[PDB]
Amino acid sequence: ASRLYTLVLVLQPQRVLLGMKKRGFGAGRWNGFGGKVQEGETIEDGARRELQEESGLTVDALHKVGQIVFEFVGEPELMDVHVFCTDSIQGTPVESDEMRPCWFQLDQIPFKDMWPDDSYWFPLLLQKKKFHGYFKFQGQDTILDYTLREVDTV
Numbered sequence: 001a002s003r004l005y006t007l008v009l010v011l012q013p014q015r016v017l018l019g020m021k022k023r024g025f026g027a028g029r030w031n032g033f034g035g036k037v038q039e040g041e042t043i044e045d046g047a048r049r050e051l052q053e054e055s056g057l058t059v060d061a062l063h064k065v066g067q068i069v070f071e072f073v074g075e076p077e078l079m080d081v082h083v084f085c086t087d088s089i090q091g092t093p094v095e096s097d098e099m100r101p102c103w104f105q106l107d108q109i110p111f112k113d114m115w116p117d118d119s120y121w122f123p124l125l126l127q128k129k130k131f132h133g134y135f136k137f138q139g140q141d142t143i144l145d146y147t148l149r150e151v152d153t154v
């Protein structure tokens with residue numbers, strides 16, 4: 001019914017790393033780094049792997065910060081996205097054919113050029129809160145309905 005994905009935010013005291021996706025689903029928007037979890041891999045190992053594939057960065061400990069389920073009306077599969085944060089990385093962000101990473105000051109997060117749900121949950125992430133969300137979309141621009149609640153255990 002739902003397929004596992006990961007999303008990783010590199011969030012430091014004064015800045016966050018986002019990646020401008022160049023191709024495929026969400027192309028043209030800034031977001032964290034993530035993708036599909038593989039056969040035989042834990043969700044956390046998938047999150048670590050996707051961060052390196054998409055940003056060139058190495059993370060050790062990842063912290064669970066959220067779960068968000070996406071529904072696209074007309075599409076059978078739900079995306080079950082496991083969201084993680086880290087403040088501690090190694091390497092320099094690398095630009096590839098798939099992704100252009102840029103640091104942003106926290107008061108300059110480019111919400112108009114991000115998926116619209118991010119305006120709801122990113123501010124929770126900035127204040128070190130944890131959350132469970134559901135967003136029902138029509139196409140990629142319209143939130144038909146949503147729920148979002150803070151939790152103590154992701």
Ligand SMILES: O=C1N=CCC(SCc2ccccc2Cl)=N1
Pocket residue numbers: 005006007025026031034035036070081115116117118
């Ligand atoms: O921020 C949002 N808002 C709605 C949909 C999405 S899907 C983009 C994505 C791609 C691969 C893995 C995880 C994610 Cl979140 N992201």
